[PDB]
């Protein structure tokens, strides 16, 4: 009957799903929609059916971190999701360019997790569906919201120690735009499961300058509003695209 | 100023913390206590002050999976936690011996995560603290609750695919007792940060037999009760041992 | 001072470059163009300035294999190249769907090389530029040439042995579309060097069926013609997009 | 047939076994016992039956290094040993706290070998039996011998070069107490073969300070005596527990 | 009928083969032989039958880089080659000792490729055949050409970046003599296929000093002539030693 | 003062050293010599000064296994050894060809240890000195003792479990000849410390057929004698060169 961790049935899963880390953000999103229906809330996983621009799609929280989000993503992908967009927060790895409150839309990720490696060899790319990427970009443009594009570092380590150096500076040099914790895992599971994925992120600080105070847990309100509008617009567009085809 | 994810202050961190994966379990635990004070609930991290046998210790949810729980464990360990017990659920890797509803107290874990390896070389052991392990066993004995002891596989993969073999059969052959998702990460962070750690776990099925229906999300009620009484008793003892 | 292997000057590098494995193919491609100027031919590296649709871009061969093509790509990327499209041949990993003579436009690749790992950690993705991918797709559509899209396995091993199993079946299960030898190396070097990359590939057989005679390195004529038309259209278009 | 390297029979293997690296230490241990029976001495592997406090248990040398000790431990574990305590020497990784002559009882180890990795994936822990650990600690207490506790780094490299940096400072930062060469291997083999293991070690120097002469393989004699008494007492105690239960 | 990349038949393969990176070099070697017969040229793989001192052996180019040369080497080893000598160019990893133009004959190599690892575990050595090494050395002394001997680093990376350190300095400290791109791949494939291998290399610069001019794409002409004389003489001796 | 583990002084170390695993073999060897002087016996490390064919060289035991032998080898290489030959026992990886009692002379090895990896990256070859190899082979030929040549797998695992597959069958398919536990470690330390190394090994069984009784660690006496004569002759011949 009910999925094991989402506690919703196969029949409640829609072709398009918006995922977010923070079950709090699901509440912020659902009020922006035309209407919504709360489906379930188990553990970190809160599921709401959204109605927006004539379309029906779930918004589901995935929790912090790749192993816990993989549980969510597998239950979605194995039970009928066709398109999953992650809308999340991130740190800037290009502090001269990308600042707090800026928005980045990402087409690929660094697999600095474990779960993707337990599913497929490390040489395999974490890459999004490029039409989902294009839809996110197009929606930002339609909405007159400037955005960055680039690779996300998805790292399982949020707090580094002083023993093993963090790879973040290496990846900055390699031109990764941003760092968060879940996108690579989504992308790999999606590819493996024939599910189209993408990622849009809001910057909350720069991990190179956390000792300087370059962090705020409270996201820039109008920029957060803009990201949700872009993410919802893209989900509705991909839902109408899916429904036609 | 509050911890970034826990959203409690450093002053609110007690020497002993009981951690669980499911925020819903915090409510089940806190009502077993003599009294409790709700502190915060942010993301999947719910924090309550428990009072039990005259002692005071936090109960905090850490969510599913090693990277998410590491955020919780670092915030506790960097801000004054001295002892942390994980009370969680697990699958049996020894189905002939360890059955649904049984309880395992674990002394060490397999580091099938990523974050511990981002903190220290993979050769380093995920090992719990002796006194914690011993207190858990002694409490089970006093409560007359049979338990197993053994190594946990802490794996970031809950749902395997058909491409890369799961290592679970290998580790069963190596005499690992159970599997869950967080314990190795706790142990390694605790060793690195000089925090004493331990784990007690309730069996909810067997991953080798999920296709036969050997799984139930609803934990055997009396055994969950016993596990909680053991964990709370050990937390209270360790809180007085710490004073001492 | 000439580039060490290409034997052309920095001054001769154009923003857009079309790369191919076979120096013989550079000569097939140039005659399709409006006009051309031969620049150099050293080792496997043949360089020709192409004129097409009022645009100017190099076509340069890179030889067989990741280490040799990296020398080519580094010399291009460090001396003024801004967009590099690889037009190559490949095997199908999905023989029921993708057949000899079909064309695949690839957005990402498996890094089964060494040189990319000597440049950046394994976890980093081999991923192409969206604009380049989109332009290649749009030109195929404008020419009414059907194409597949997907991930290529870029493997340094063409001939497997009987000791260490090939990962090709694993990657087929993982939904990789095709296999060749250079594309992951191109994509990683491009990302590190801020150069936009992409790949278009023609199927010459299926490695799973070589023992059945499912192979022919005489590429299907009208299909090779189609792929060259799309690649040249995309280069010309991207040359003007760069100018803007 | 005799065991290939120990050259004793399966029938001579006792439930409890004390192992040491140095065959010479088997000579210092045995004369401490009530009585002993010299069994065999083949290659670096010297085996004696010890009789101490009413109990009977082998003492066996395992040689220097993880691959050589694995041969010994496999022959013991595959032929009836149920408890193996290693009593060894080690270097300090915490020179401000742990000094030459001090004794450390360890309950897990860093797997800086190869043979354990040829037997099980690297993520698997090298961990001791915590009853064995507790018995060693309790014996140290009864004898009024202060001890340290913590993780040993078990490294196959004794003499580092200037090319690949040693991981020893890393592991010092990670709170590993001491370094030696065999304990991880014993622990992993014991876990795989259902044999309870533990480790007690005497400090002979600090590897960070070898260039300053912080080393002497002449072990502090009164502390070596103490370590032997703790190890023998723990073996005898575990032997009785074994016999009562079995 | 024809090998996929070399486009020669099995019947055209001689027991001894000289391999070189550059197809241009096959043309330069062949004209130096007593006579020759061009066989094939496809992609970067050019195949010519050489006749020298009464013996015959192919000279075949393998291209730049391990994956490209493995295609060539597999085709030779699986179709009847019995002895393969690589003659090539290299950088010095010992610049106080081994200079531009110097000649190094190598008995083993560092496996800094991927293809050898896709064939056999990384712990397996890249090692050449003794007789081949000894024959090379003996021809060198015969012709009174000083040579060095040691290990080559065969690295898939010619141009390092500033993110992941090159291991070349480590391998210099480890006493590797020189660096090039193909020899370890030849050695491993040879061992796996029961084919006897070896390497002779001429130094064209030092990768530690490229940023100060220690490089020249013109190989010292007379030292190069000497290297090739050594290589051809050895191929002839081995074609008889094999015989 | 004394070497930590060998318990001899640097002054006692000769240019050429013969190493064996078993201290009992040192006692066996020394009595074949013209004369000897017992120097030290500490732990597994027994040191004797041998006098054979007018030459002087140590014979020292290194114990079982790579980590223990590395301690012996570093002490030798860091205090004056120039040439080290290992004379050991091994299992056959090619049981149709190489049988109990056969002798193999080896010139490279699989690095299935840890200590070599803690000293240099895994891609680096474990390779013997080719002059030492040649000296061993020539000594065998002139004593009319047939020998095999090839790669040894040096594996830290003697007793495999049923969880992780042994790589031995893979290495047999890769044409490795025999398996033992120390040679790769010797070769790597020697290359790093500029010491010339080599290995001669007598087969005591086949690990693929241990469950059929294909083992006896009583080495074939006449064959052990032959190996010792070969190793001793090579040590002397190499010792005349030091100067
Ligand atoms: O800076 C960060 N690092 C990792 N994850 C994040 N999510 C928001 N900011 C960050
Ligand atoms: O079977 C399991 N596997 C991983 N985590 C778990 N938590 C409860 N059961 C399990
Ligand atoms: O099948 C193939 N495998 C690898 N490279 C290729 N290039 C064309 N076809 C192939
Ligand atoms: O300092 C040491 N290092 C490694 N092993 C040891 N055994 C005793 N001391 C040491
Ligand atoms: O310096 C070099 N590095 C790599 N390959 C080479 N081939 C000639 N010189 C070199
Ligand atoms: O069969 C063997 N395996 C490993 N080491 C050995 N030493 C002698 N025989 C063997
Ligand atoms: O605060 C950490 C969280 O924000 C972004 C990141 O991906 C993680 O879930
Ligand atoms: O259902 C999975 C959860 O239960 C136990 C495991 O550790 C994880 O948090
Ligand atoms: O035949 C192998 C060649 O064709 C395509 C492949 O990428 C390589 O260059
Ligand atoms: O000298 C080093 C030896 O002593 C302790 C170490 O474990 C090794 O056996
Ligand atoms: O310059 C690069 C080429 O020369 C030697 C090297 O092996 C490569 O093939
Ligand atoms: O019996 C094992 C011993 O013999 C040869 C091997 O290398 C080891 O020292
Ligand atoms: Na989580
Ligand atoms: Na050419
Ligand atoms: Na090439
Ligand atoms: Na891109
Ligand atoms: Na030993």
Numbering used by the authors:
A (entry chain B): 3 to 247
B (entry chain A), C (entry chain D): 3 to 246
D (entry chain C): 3 to 248
E (entry chain F), F (entry chain E): 3 to 245
Reproduce, without paraphrasing, sentences from the article in which this PDB structure was first reported:
Purine nucleoside phosphorylase (PNP) is central to purine salvage mechanisms in Plasmodium parasites, the causative agents of malaria. Purine nucleoside phosphorylase (PNP) in Plasmodium forms a key enzyme in the recycling of predominantly host-derived purines, catalysing the phosphorolysis of inosine to produce the major purine precursor for the salvage pathway, hypoxanthine, and ribose-1-phosphate. Crystal structures and sequence homology studies have distinguished two broad families of PNP enzymes: those that form trimers (such as the mammalian PNPs, Type 2) and those that are hexameric (such as E.coli PNP (EcPNP), Type 1). Crystallographic studies of PfPNP have shown it forms a hexameric assembly suggesting its closer alignment with the Type 1 PNP group, although functionally it has been noted that, unlike other hexameric PNPs, adenosine is not a substrate for PfPNP.
The asymmetric unit consists of one hexamer of PfPNP in which there are six very similar, but not identical, subunits. In accordance with the shapes, sizes and positions of electron density observed within the active site, the products hypoxanthine base, ribose sugar and arsenate anion (AsO4) – formed from the irreversible arsenolysis of inosine followed by hydrolysis of the ribose-1-arsenate – were modelled in to the observed electron density map. In all subunits, the arsenate moiety is stabilised mainly by two arginine side chains (Arg 88 and Arg 45' of the neighbouring subunit) and further hydrogen bonds are formed with donors from the hydroxyl group of Ser 91 and the backbone amino groups of Gly 23 and Ser 91. However the participation of the Arg 27 residue in the anion binding pocket, where its guanidinium side chain forms charged hydrogen bonds with the arsenate molecule, has not been observed in structures with sulphate bound. In the PfPNP-HRA complex, in five of the subunits the Arg 27 side chain points toward the active site ('closed' conformation, average torsion angle χ1 = 163° and χ2 = 175°) and forms hydrogen bonds with oxygen atoms of the arsenate ion. By contrast, in chain F this arginine is in an 'open' conformation with its side chain pointing away from the active site (torsion angle χ1 = 178° and χ2 = 75°) and hence does not interact with the arsenate ion. Similar to the PfPNP-Imm complex, the carboxylate group of the Asp 206 side chain interacts directly with N7 of the hypoxanthine, and has been proposed to be the general acid/base for protonation of N7 of the substrate in the transition state. In the PfPNP-HRA complex, although all active sites are occupied, in four subunits (A,B,D,E) the active site loop is ordered – indicative of a catalytically-active form – whereas its disorder in subunits C and F may reflect the start of a transition in which the enzyme adopts a 'relaxed state' to release the products of arsenolysis. At this point the C1' atom lies equidistant between the N9 of the base and the incoming phosphate/arsenate oxygen nucleophile.
